[PDB]
Design a protein around this ligand. Sequence first.
Ligand SMILES: C[C@H](C(=O)O)N1C(=O)[C@@H]2[C@@H]3CC[C@@H](C3)[C@@H]2C1=O
Ligand SMILES: C[C@H](C(=O)O)N1C(=O)[C@@H]2[C@H]3CC[C@H](C3)[C@@H]2C1=O
Length: 358
Amino acid sequence: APQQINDIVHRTITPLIEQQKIPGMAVAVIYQGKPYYFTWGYADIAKKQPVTQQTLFELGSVSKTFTGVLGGDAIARGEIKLSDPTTKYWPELTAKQWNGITLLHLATYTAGGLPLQVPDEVKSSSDLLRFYQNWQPAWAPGTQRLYANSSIGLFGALAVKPSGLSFEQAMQTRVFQPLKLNHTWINVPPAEEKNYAWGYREGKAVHVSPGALDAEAYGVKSTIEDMARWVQSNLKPLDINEKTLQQGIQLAQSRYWQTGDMYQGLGWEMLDWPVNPDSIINGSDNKIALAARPVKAITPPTPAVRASWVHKTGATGGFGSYVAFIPEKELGIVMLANKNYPNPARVDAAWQILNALQ
Ligand SMILES: C[C@H](C(=O)O)N1C(=O)[C@@H]2[C@@H]3CC[C@@H](C3)[C@@H]2C1=O
Ligand SMILES: C[C@H](C(=O)O)N1C(=O)[C@@H]2[C@H]3CC[C@H](C3)[C@@H]2C1=O
């Protein structure tokens, strides 16, 4: 491994782990297209299992990038259009407030204030219908961004309806398999349980609990190797042999809305490179905690801009993840941890590392 890569990673991550009390961590740096791997600590404290390049971490909301891309793939296949009314794919959604709410709004959290979480009370399909029918927007569609699992979650579920595949089957066949992400899972199979890290929340070992639209919004588990390959696939989508998938990746990094210095993609969020630290450390997306922001429509959406900081933060109760890349520089980072530690700390470390390497 290049000593420059070795030194910046270790010097940045070691104190991060110490200060955040992170039980276990995996990091990939993509430098000139090539992945370099680094691991620390424990996937399972009790059983003394170390973090390896084969350890599975819960990605949490980094799952939304897969959802966005699968969605873009369905657009490329001609199965859906982002301008489609939500009701085209869910005709039972007859409540009036849904008039004017498109798949674009769902995908980009601009539907008019769909809540961050689907309520735990929603435990059936009829429950979910009731929930969406009864939801009252605070804002007109396409006027404000409010980060919401119930928004992109619903986008994910509807985007696959024409295919007739379940969200999981469609994700596996159309994204995971073609990209050879053979250790990326919506549901961790028994064969992989030995590699599945425990997350840690207030000293307890925890895994994400099932919930409505969890797959679509926060339910992917992946290894550092697969995540590096995910970054490579998004850094240079033209190297991909399946056309619709290559096009789907491109669509996911298009710029649909602007708030402040950030542009909303499908799952991915983007800022112009070079970035103000600062404006990302600071920043988004979210406002964590939690931020209704006015959006300016980008009419029409700007195609994927090479000179971008493209990123997504993700958490579950026991895990914290971060992915960032700069297409123009063939440069990226994945940080996977089995503790949910503050977003600004992840962004700072990712910035420290990538700035030094570009
Ligand atoms: C398919 C490939 C192989 O050896 O052909 N492979 C496996 O062996 C399973 C086991 C050995 C490594 C991992 C678990 C997974 C993998 O990539
Ligand atoms: C990943 C995301 C984030 O940090 O950006 N996030 C969470 O903390 C988890 C908790 C579990 C689902 C929801 C709440 C989920 C969420 O939106």
